[PDB]
DNA sequence: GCAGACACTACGAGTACATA
DNA sequence: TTTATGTACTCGTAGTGTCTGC
C-alpha cells in the first residue's frame, strides 16, 4: 500500500550510492566493517593505515537528518550481517543492559540459520542508535557501553548527535571516530530534482540553495517541507521562497562557541543591527546556553578589537566598563545560587553577565573563541587546596 | 446549588477549519491537509489562546468522523507522561490495527508537549521513526524549543502568530450575532485593546461585561477589567518630569494594590522590549531595576525603593 | 620538629612573657573556672591567639591539655556527597575548624556541638579561623551555644572579626590581641637565637627581620629558618632579606601594572592570576597585598593613590559578596589600569 | 476509673475495621456515645465517604458517660493495632477530656500486657448526617465475587461502569488495551445461601466509578462475606459491610458524564 | 527443517529447572557437555565455578523421573543464562524436556504438550 | 586439609541468613575444636561472634588453624543453590585461595560441585572483655522479635529496664508511647517457652532500633534468646546453637 | 498445613532543570 | 573538581501480601 507512507520512508535509499553527500563515511565505515574478521584473527594488535584492525567498535555522530541510520543499516545489511538495532524506547539501565545484550555480544543469531553464499549471516552487529538519549550517567549504561567495546565478540556501533558532552566523555579513543558532516547543495540538488520528478511539483533550480541553508542541510525536514508545500501549492520560485523561508526556519540551539561568536559580533549593537536582533533575541542567546555562557563571555572579552567605542573612550575604558558588569553579575550569580535560591534573576544575570559587557568590546576578534579556561584552572585549584588539608592533617 | 451556564470559551467553541480565523495560509494548509488526508507531523507553536488546540482537534475531527473515539490517542501534562507510561501507551497505540479509510492514518495528539521530559522525547523519536504509515503525530506547545531538535527534524514545524484586530472584531460580532446583547462600538474597542490578540481573553471580558452590567460599554468594561500593567508601566518608565512618574507610581500601582514584586518584573520586561530609546539607556536601565529587584527580593518591599529605582531611571535620562 | 616556630612555643600564662595586661586578664579569667564566659579573641594574625588559648586552657583545666589525638569522623550531606573532616580531640576540650567545603559546615559544626553537649564541669570548644563561617552556620551556633552553657563553653578564635555577625559577637566576650613590637620579636628572635647555634654578630639583622614580617611571629620565624638554614647557620650584616613567592610575584605584577597599561598585558595579569589562585591564596589578601603594593609605588600620584583605594574597597565589597574570586580581582585591574 | 472502657472480644476485629478503611481515609473522628463508637471521614479529595458504627453487642463491656470525639491518624492507629496479636484483648481507655487513649493488650494464657498509647488530634470537622434514603437498585453479593470482579476489570481501564437491568447486573470496563464485560444473575444457592446474590431493580442504574476508590471499597471485603450495594441515579452508592452489631458503609460518588 | 542432532537429552523439567536455577546463580553463561554417556553442566563465573554430574538411567516406580540419553557425536555447546531462566520458566507445561544438542545448530528444548509442544530455539553462543 | 562434612546445610545457611546484614567480610578463623569468627560493623557499634563446635558436624578434620576471609552474598547464593536431604561438605586445601563446597545428595542423580575465592580481609582484634553481666534474662526468641518491631515502629530508641522481676520494654516516639511488661512465667508442659529472669542489680539502657532491628535475624538458630545486661559493658545477646552459639555485642546508647 | 512464587505498593538514591 | 534547595523522574531495591501445590 503506497501513496500513503511519507515522502521521508518511500524514498529512502535502498543501495549504498544513494546515500547523497559524506562518500568518505561510508565508505569508511564499510571499510572497516568489511575487514574485521581478519583484525579478529589479528586479536585487534595490528591496524593499516586507516586503524581499522585496533578499533573494535565504530561510533556515528553528526546532525540530525544526514543518514547516519540509513547509511549503518544499508552497510550492515548489504554485507551479509544480521541487523540488532538497539534504541531508548527500551531501557538500557545497569541492570536491563546487563540483562539485554551482554548475552549476545558473544553469542550468533538463530535466525541466520533459516535465512540461509553468506559468510556472516550467522553473526550480529550491534546498531545502538539514541546512545546521547541515555541521560543516566553514573550507573546509567555508558560505563556498560564503555565494557562492551572493551569487549565484544560482533561489531558494534553508536549513533549520536555530538560528542561535546560530559556525558560522553568514556568514549575518548576507545572507539572509532567516523563523523558525518553536512552534505553538498549538488547531491541534495540532484536528489531533490528526482523526488520533483517523481512527485509532479515545481522546484526551481535556484530557490533550493536557500532550502537547504534555512534547513541547516536536515534532508528530513527539506523533504517534509516540499511535501507540506506542494500539497496546497507545487510550485515555487523567488515570489514564495522568502515566506517560506521564514516559517520554516530550523532556529538551532547554538553552539556555546556559537553564542559567544554572535555576542561578540559589532554589528547587532549598531542602529540597523538592534533593531533586527533586538534585546530579548540577546537575552534568549543567552537563556540558549545560560551555564556556560556567563564564562565564555568573559574569557574572551578583552580580545576583541573594538568597534562600539564611545568617542574620546579608550578600549582599555571600555574593557573595565565591562569588566565592572562581570564583577556586578557575579554577585546576582551568587545570590542565585545560594540558600535562598532566587531562581527569578536570570534575566537580570543575562543582561549583566552576558549583554552588557558584550556591549562594549564588540568588533572583529584578535584570534578564535577561546574555550572557558576557568574550569581547568579550577579543577587545578581544587587539588591544590585538597593537597593542602591533606599535608595540614598530616603535619598536626 | 444553583446551575452553571456553559461558558462562551466552549460554548462557541469551532468545530470546523472553516470557523477558526485567524492565519490565513495556515488554516487552508490545514484544510488542504483534510481535504487530502495525507497528514504529516506536525508541531503547531504560537502564543497563548490564539486558537493551537482547536484547531488540531478540528483537523482530527474532520480526518476521523467516524473513529475519533477510536483512532485518535490524546494525552496532556494531566496524564502521566513519563517514559514507562509513554512506551507503553504510546507503542500499544501505534500498533493498534484499526482499518482506517485509505488516506486516514491514526492521529496521537500531544497537548503542552513543551513541558515533556526529554527522555520521552527521545523514546518518542524512535516510535516515530518505526510507526509512520499508519499513525502520525501531533503536538501543540507554547514555546518550541523545549523539543529537542530531532522530533523537529521528523517533523512539520507550522507556527501561528498573533491575530490582528479585525479577525478578534470579526469573531466577536459573530458571537453577537450567535447571542442577542447590547453593545457600543466604544466597549468592543476597548475589549479588543484589552486582549491584546488573545481571542480566549477578549472573549472572557465580554462574558464578564455582559454578565455583569448586560451593555457593552468602555466604562463597563474598564470596571470589569482594569488597564493591563504593562501599558501603565510603559507610560510610568517612558515619561520624563520625574515628579510626573513619581505620581503615575503612587497613583496606578501604589493605590491600586499592585506588589513591588509585580511592579519591578513588568519594568524589567517593558525595559527588555521597550524600543522607542536606543540600546545603551536600555541596558543601563535594566541595571538600574535590577539593582531595584535584588534590594527588593532580599526583603525590603517599600514604596520608597521603587521611587528611588525612578529618580536613578530618571537622573540617566537626563544624562546627569 | 625540625621547624624552631612549633617547639618553641610556650606552654604556660607564666611563660608569656608578651602583654603583661593581655596576660593579667587571661590570669583574672583563670582565677574562677566555675564563672567563665564564651570568649572571642580577635586581632592581627600570626601575633599567638592560640598560643593564649592553649596557655588560658592549661590554666584552667590542668595538664594534658597539650595531648591531642586525631580522631577522624564522617558527615552525611545532600546526594551522594561525602564528607570526611577529622576533629582535632583532646581530654577536657575539643577543637574543630571550617576545613570542609565551604557552603555546606552547617551540618558538622551543629552535630559536633550537639554530641560534645551531650558528654572542670564543662569541656571547652576551640573554633580556628572562625572569620570564614558561613553567616547560616552562625546563625546555627547562636542557640546552640546559648542554649547549653553548664556543659560547653566556646572559646572562638578569628581574625578581622566583621564578618562575624552581631548576636555571636553579643554573647561572645570579646579579647583583643595586638600584634608583637618591634621589641619583643627583636626580644623572642634573641631568646631563640641564643638556644640555638647561629653565627650572629649584629642585633641590626633581627631588626631587620621584626621590620620585615609587619608584627608577624610565625612569619618571622620561618624566615629566620629559612635564611639560616642558608646562610649556614652564620647570618650576615648584609644579608638580603628573603619573601615568600606569592609576595614576589605579586611585587612583580604590581610592576607590570605600573610599567604598561595594555590589553595583552591584561590577558597576561589574567594568567598570573589563575595561577596565585590555584596556588591556594585567597582572595581578599591577594587584592589587600596588591592594592598595598600598588600604593606604595612612588611613581604614582595621590590622585590615583586615592581612585586605587577607592576601587580597591569597592571591588574588596564585591570579593566579599562574590564566589568566583576572579573577575573582582581581573575587574580590580581593569580600573586600576585605567585610572593609571 | 476512666470514663471510656471499651474492651474488644477477639481483638482482631478492631484491627479488621481500621484497616478496612485505613488506605482510603487518612484523618477520622470517633463519636463514642452510649450507644456505640461511630465514626465518619471523607477523604482528602472529597469522593468517598466512610460511616462507620459498632454496637454494644461487639463489646464484652462498654461504658461511656459522656459524648466523646476522638480525632485520630489512621496510619498510626494501624500501626498500634498492628503491635499485638489476635489471641490478646484489646481496650480503648480515655479519661475526661482526653489527650490520647490507652490500648491493653491482654491475655490470660501468658502474662505480657502490653500497654500503648496514641496521641489524639482536633480535626474539627462536623460533617453531617447521611441525607440518602430511597435507592433505585438494592443489590447483594458475597464479598468475594465482588472483590475478584473489581480487581480483575480494574486492570482494564479506570473507569468501571456498573448496570443495573431485569435480573441483570453488568459490569463494562472498556479501556486502551481492550474492553470487559462481566454479566451475573441472581440465583438462590440453597446449599451456601452465603453464595446467593440478590437482586431488587426499582428503576434503570447506569453508573461508572473510579478504579482506584472502588478498590479501596473491595480491600474491606475481608471484613465481611457480603457487601450489598445499593445505587440510585443523582445519589452515591452504599455498599455496606454488615458487622455482628453494627456496618460499614461507604460512599462513592459516580463520576461525570458528558 | 528437520535435522538430525548429535544428542538428545530428556530429562524431568522440574530436576532441570532446579539443576540450571542453581548454576545461574554463579555464572551468567553454561557449559553444558555430552561426552561418554554423562552430562556434565558446568558454569564458571568471577565468583567461582560450579558443575553438575548426572547419570541416565530408568525409574521402574516412576518412569517420569528418568533420564535417557542417546549418543550419536559428542557435543561443545554454551549458553547464556537469562536465556535458559526464560526457556526454564515454561517448565510447568511438561513433566518432561526434550533437549537436542548439535555442534552446529541451534539448541531444541522441547516440552511435549498433551496435543502440541513449545520447542524453544537457543543460539549457542562462539566457540 | 579441612574437611567440614555437614549432616543438612540448612544449618549452616540459617546461621549465614542469621549474620547476612550484621556484617558483609567475615575472617573464618577455623581450629581443630571447631570454627569461630568475630566480626564488626561499619559503625564500631555492634559485634558479632559465631562459634559451633565439631558435635554439629557429622565429620571435621582440621589439623592446620587457616583464617579464611570469604564473603556473604556468594555464600548466600551458593547456599540458596542447597536444600534439604543433601550433605554440605566444606572441603579446604593446603593452601586454599578457593574454597570447595559440595552438595552430596543421599541419591546419585545429580552431585553439584562449587568454588569460591578467598578475598584479603585482616584479621580482626580479638578482644576477649567478658565483663560481669549484672541481670540476666531468656525469652522465647519469637517473643523478643515481636517485641522489638513492635516498638521499632512507634521509635527509633528502645528504653528496656529491669526492676521487681518485670522487663519493660518502653519506646517512646512521636505517634504515640508503647510499654510492654514481662513477667517471669514458668511452664510445665512446655518449658521451652518460659520467662526467667536473673535480677542481681536494676539496670536501665537504652539501644538504637535499628541494631535491635538487626540482631533478630539469628531468630531462626535458637527458639530462645539470653540476654545479659551490665550498665556499662555490652549488652550481650546469645543464641543458642546444638554445638555452640552465636552472640551479639551491642554498647548500650544513653 | 507450610514453603515457596508471584505481583504488588513502598522506600531509597541519583540525575536534571530552575523565565517565559 | 561549582554552584545548592526544592521538585520531578527514574530506577532498582526490599519487604509485603496473596495464590499453588507438595
Ligand atoms: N543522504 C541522504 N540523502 C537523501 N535522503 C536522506 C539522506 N540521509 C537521510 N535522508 C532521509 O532521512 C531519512 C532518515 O534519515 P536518518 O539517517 O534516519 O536520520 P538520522 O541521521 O538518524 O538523524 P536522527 O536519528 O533523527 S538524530 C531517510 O529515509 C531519507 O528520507
Ligand atoms: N481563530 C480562532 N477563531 C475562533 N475562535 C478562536 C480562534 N482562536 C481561538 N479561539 C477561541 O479561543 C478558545 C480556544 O483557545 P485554545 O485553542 O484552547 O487556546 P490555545 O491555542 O490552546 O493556547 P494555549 O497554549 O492552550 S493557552 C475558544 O473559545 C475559541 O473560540
Ligand atoms: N610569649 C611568647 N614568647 C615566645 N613566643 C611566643 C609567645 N607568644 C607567642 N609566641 C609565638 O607564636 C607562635 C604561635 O603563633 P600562633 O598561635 O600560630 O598565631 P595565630 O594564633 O595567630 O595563628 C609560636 O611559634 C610562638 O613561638
Ligand atoms: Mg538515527
Ligand atoms: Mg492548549
Known amino acids: 500500500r503506497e501513496e500513503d507512507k511519507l515522502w521521508t520512508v518511500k524514498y529512502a535509499p535502498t543501495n549504498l550510492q544513494q546515500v547523497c553527500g559524506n562518500k568518505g563515511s561510508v565508505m569508511k565505515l564499510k571499510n572497516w566493517l568489511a575487514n574485521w574478521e581478519n583484525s579478529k584473527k589479528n ?123 560530559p556525558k560522553m566523555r568514556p568514549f575518548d579513543r576507545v572507539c572509532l571516530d567516523i563523523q558525518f558532516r553536512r552534505p553538498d547543495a549538488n547531491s541534495i540538488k540532484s536528489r531533490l530534482m528526482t523526488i520533483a520528478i517523481r512527485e509532479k511539483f515545481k522546484l526551481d533550480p535556484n530557490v533550493i540553495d536557500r532550502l537547504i541553508q534555512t534547513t541547516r542541510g536536515d534532508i528530513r525536514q527539506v523533504i517534509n517541507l516540499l511535501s507540506t508545500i506542494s500539497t496546497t501549492t507545487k510550485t515555487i520560485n523567488h515570489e514564495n521562497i522568502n515566506e517560506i523561508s521564514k516559517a520554516w ?148 | 446549588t444553583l446551575s452553571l451556564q456553559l461558558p462562551w470559551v466552549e460554548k462557541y467553541r469551532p468545530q470546523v477549519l472553516s470557523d477558526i480565523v485567524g492565519n490565513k495560509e495556515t488554516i487552508d494548509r490545514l484544510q488542504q491537509i483534510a481535504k487530502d488526508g495525507n497528514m504529516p507531523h506536525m508541531i503547531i507553536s504560537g502564543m497563548p489562546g490564539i486558537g493551537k488546540t482547536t484547531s488540531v482537534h478540528c483537523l482530527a475531527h474532520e480526518l476521523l468522523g467516524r473513529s475519533y473515539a477510536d483512532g485518535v490517542l490524546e494525552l496532556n501534562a494531566s496524564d502521566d507522561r513519563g517514559i514507562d507510561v509513554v512506551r507503553n501507551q504510546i507503542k500499544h497505540f501505534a500498533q493498534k490495527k484499526l482499518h482506517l479509510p485509505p488516506g486516514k492514518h491514526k492521529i496521537v495528539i500531544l497537548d503542552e508537549a513543551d513541558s515533556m521530559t526529554a527522555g520521552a522525547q527521545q ?198 | 620538629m625540625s621547624l624552631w616556630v612549633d617547639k618553641y612555643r610556650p606552654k604556660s600564662l607564666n611563660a608569656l612573657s608578651h602583654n603583661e595586661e593581655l596576660t593579667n586578664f587571661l590570669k583574672s579569667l583563670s582565677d574562677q573556672p566555675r564563672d567563665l564566659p564564651h570568649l572571642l579573641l580577635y586581632g592581627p594574625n600570626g601575633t599567638g591567639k592560640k598560643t593564649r588559648c592553649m596557655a588560658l586552657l592549661e590554666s584552667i583545666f590542668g595538664p594534658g591539655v597539650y595531648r591531642l589525638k586525631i580522631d577522624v569522623r564522617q558527615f552525611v550531606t545532600a546526594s551522594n556527597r561525602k564528607l570526611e573532616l577529622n576533629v582535632v580531640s583532646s581530654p577536657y576540650h575539643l577543637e574543630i575548624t571550617p576545613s570542609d567545603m565551604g557552603n555546606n559546615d552547617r551540618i558538622v559544626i551543629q552535630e559536633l556541638l550537639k554530641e560534645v553537649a551531650q558528654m572542670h564541669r564543662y569541656k571547652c570548644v576551640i573554633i580556628n579561623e572562625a572569620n570564614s563561617l558561613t553567616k547560616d552556620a552562625q546563625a546555627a551556633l547562636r542557640r546552640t551555644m546559648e542554649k547549653y552553657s553548664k556543659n560547653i563553653r566556646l572559646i572562638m578564635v578569628c581574625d578581622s572579626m566583621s564578618p562575624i555577625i552581631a548576636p555571636i559577637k553579643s554573647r561572645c566576650l570579646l579579647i583583643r590581641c595586638p600584634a608583637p613590637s ?159 | 476509673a476512666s470514663m471510656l472502657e471499651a474492651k474488644f472480644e477477639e481483638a482482631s476485629l478492631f484491627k479488621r475495621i481500621i484497616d478496612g478503611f485505613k488506605d482510603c481515609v487518612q484523618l477520622v473522628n470517633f463519636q463514642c456515645k452510649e450507644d456505640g463508637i461511630i465514626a465518619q471521614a471523607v477523604d482528602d479529595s472529597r469522593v468517598l465517604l466512610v460511616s462507620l458504627e459498632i454496637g454494644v453487642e461487639a463489646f464484652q463491656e462498654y461504658r461511656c458517660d459522656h459524648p466523646v470525639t476522638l480525632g485520630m491518624d489512621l496510619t498510626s492507629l494501624s500501626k498500634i493495632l498492628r503491635c499485638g496479636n489476635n489471641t490478646d484483648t484489646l481496650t480503648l481507655i480515655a479519661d475526661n477530656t482526653p489527650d490520647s487513649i490507652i490500648l491493653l493488650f491482654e491475655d490470660t494464657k501468658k502474662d505480657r500486657i502490653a500497654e500503648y498509647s496514641l496521641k489524639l488530634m482536633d480535626i474539627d470537622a462536623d460533617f453531617l448526617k447521611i441525607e440518602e434514603l430511597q435507592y433505585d437498585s438494592t443489590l447483594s453479593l458475597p464479598s468475594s465475587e465482588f472483590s475478584k470482579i473489581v480487581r480483575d476489570l480494574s486492570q482494564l481501564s479506570d473507569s468501571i461502569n456498573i448496570m443495573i437491568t431485569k435480573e441483570t447486573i453488568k459490569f463494562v470496563a472498556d479501556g486502551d488495551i481492550g474492553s470487559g464485560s462481566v454479566i451475573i444473575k441472581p440465583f438462590v444457592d440453597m446449599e451456601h445461601p452465603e453464595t446467593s446474590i440478590k437482586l431488587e431493580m426499582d428503576q434503570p442504574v447506569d453508573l461508572t466509578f473510579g478504579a482506584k476508590y472502588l478498590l479501596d471499597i473491595i480491600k474491606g471485603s475481608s471484613l465481611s462475606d457480603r457487601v450489598g450495594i445499593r445505587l440510585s441515579s443523582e445519589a452515591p452508592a452504599l455498599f455496606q459491610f454488615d458487622l455482628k452489631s453494627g456496618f460499614l458503609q461507604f460512599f462513592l460518588a459516580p463520576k461525570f458524564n458528558d
Request: aromatic share 6%.
Open chain 1, 249 to 396: 526556519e530550523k532556529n538551532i540551539a547554538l553552539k556555546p562557541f556559537d553564542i559567544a561568536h554572535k555576542m561578540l559580533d559589532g554589528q547587532i549593537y549598531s542602529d540597523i543591527g538592534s533593531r533586527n536582533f533586538t534585546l530579548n533575541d540577546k537575552i534568549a542567546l543567552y537563556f540558549d546556553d545560560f551555564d556556560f555562557t556567563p564564562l565564555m563571555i568573559q574569557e574572551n572579552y578583552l580580545s576583541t578589537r573594538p568597534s562600539v567605542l564611545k568617542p574620546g573612550q579608550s578600549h582599555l575604558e571600555a574593557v573595565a566598563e565591562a569588566a565592572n558588569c562581570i564583577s556586578l553579575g557575579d554577585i546576582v550569580e551568587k545570590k542565585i545560587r545560594s540558600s535562598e535560591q532566587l531562581w527569578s534573576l536570570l534575566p537580570l544575570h543575562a543582561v549583566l553577565s552576558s549583554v552588557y559587557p558584550a556591549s562594549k568590546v564588540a568588533g572583529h576578534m584578535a584570534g578564535r573563541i577561546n574555550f572557558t579556561a576557568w574550569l581547568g584552572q579550577n579543577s587545578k585549584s581544587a587539588k591544590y587546596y585538597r593537597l593542602l588539608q591533606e599535608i595540614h592533617y598530616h603535619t598536626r
Open chain 2, 123 to 320: 523514546a518518542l523519536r524512535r516510535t516515530m521513526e518505526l510507526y509512520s504509515n499508519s499513525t502520525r503525530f501531533a503536538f501543540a506547545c507554547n514555546q518550541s524549543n523545549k523539543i529537542i531538535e530531532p522530533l523537529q527534524s521528523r517533523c512539520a514545524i507550522l507556527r501561528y502568530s498573533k491575530l490582528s484586530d479585525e479577525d478578534v472584531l470579526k469573531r466577536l460580532l459573530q458571537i453577537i450575532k450567535l447571542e442577542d446583547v447590547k453593545y457600543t462600538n466604544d466597549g468592543l474597542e476597548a475589549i479588543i485593546f484589552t486582549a491584546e490578540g488573545d481571542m480566549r481573553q477578549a472573549i472572557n471580558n465580554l462574558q464578564s461585561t455582559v454578565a455583569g452590567h448586560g451593555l457593552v460599554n468602555a466604562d463597563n468594561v474598564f470596571k470589569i477589567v482594569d488597564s493591563p500593567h504593562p501599558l501603565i508601566v510603559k507610560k510610568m518608565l517612558l515619561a520624563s518630569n520625574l515628579e510626573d512618574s513619581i505620581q503615575i507610581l503612587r497613583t496606578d500601582l501604589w493605590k491600586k494594590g499592585y506588589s513591588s514584586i509585580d511592579i519591578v518584573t513588568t519594568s524589567f520586561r517593558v525595559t527588555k522590549n521597550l524600543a522607542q530609546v536606543k540600546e545603551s539607556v536600555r541596558l543601563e536601565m535594566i541595571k538600574e531595576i535590577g539593582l531595584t529587584h535584588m534590594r527588593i527580593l532580599e526583603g525590603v518591599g517599600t514604596y520608597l525603593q521603587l521611587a528611588s529605582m525612578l529618580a536613578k531611571i530618571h537622573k540617566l535620562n537626563n544624562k546627569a
Open chain 3, 182 to 340: 618591634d621589641s619583643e620579636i627583636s626580644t623572642i628572635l634573641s631568646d631563640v637565637v641564643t638556644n640555638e647555634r647561629i653565627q650572629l654578630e649584629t642585633k641590626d639583622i633581627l631588626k631587620r627581620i621584626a621590620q620585615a614580617s609587619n608584627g608577624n611571629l610565625r612569619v618571622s620565624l620561618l624566615m629566620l629558618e629559612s635564611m639560616a638554614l642558608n646562610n649556614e647557620l652564620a647570618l650576615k650584616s648584609s644579608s638580603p632579606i628573603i619573601k615568600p613567592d606569592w609576595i614576589i610575584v605579586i611585587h612583580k605584577l604590581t610592576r607590570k601594572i605600573v610599567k604598561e597599561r595594555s590589553v595583552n598585558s591584561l590577558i597576561e595579569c589574567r594568567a598570573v592570576l589563575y595561577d596565585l589562585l590555584a596556588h591556594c591564596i585567597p582572595a581578599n589578601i591577594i587584592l589587600k597585598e596588591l592594592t598595598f603594593s600598588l600604593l606604595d609605588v612612588e611613581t604614582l600620584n595621590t590622585t590615583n593613590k586615592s581612585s586605587i583605594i577607592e576601587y580597591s574597597s569597592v571591588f574588596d565589597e564585591r570579593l566579599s559578596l562574590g564566589n568566583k574570586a576572579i573577575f573582582h580581582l581581573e575587574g580590580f585591574i581593569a580600573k586600576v589600569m585605567c585610572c593609571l
Open chain 1, 43 to 165: 586479536s585487534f594488535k595490528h591496524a593499516g593505515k586507516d586503524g581499522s584492525g585496533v578499533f573494535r567498535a565504530a561510533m556515528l555522530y553528526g546532525p540530525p537528518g544526514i543518514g547516519k541510520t540509513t547509511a549503518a543499516h544499508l552497510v550492515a545489511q548489504e554485507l551479509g550481517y544480521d541487523i540488532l538495532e538497539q534504541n531508548a524506547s527500551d531501557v538500557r539501565s545497569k541492570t536491563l543492559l546487563n540483562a539485554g545484550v551482554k548475552n549476545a555480544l558473544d553469542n550468533m543469531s538463530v535466525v541466520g540459520y533459516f535465512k540461509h553464499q553468506n559468510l556472516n549471516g550467522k553473526h550480529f552487529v550491534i546498531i545502538m542508535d539514541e546512545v546521547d538519549g541515555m541521560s543516566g550517567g553514573d550507573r546509567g549504561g555508558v560505563g556498560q557501553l564503555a565494557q562492551f567495546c572493551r569487549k565484544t565478540s560482533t561489531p558494534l556501533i553508536l549513533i549520536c548527535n555530538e560528542r561535546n558532552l
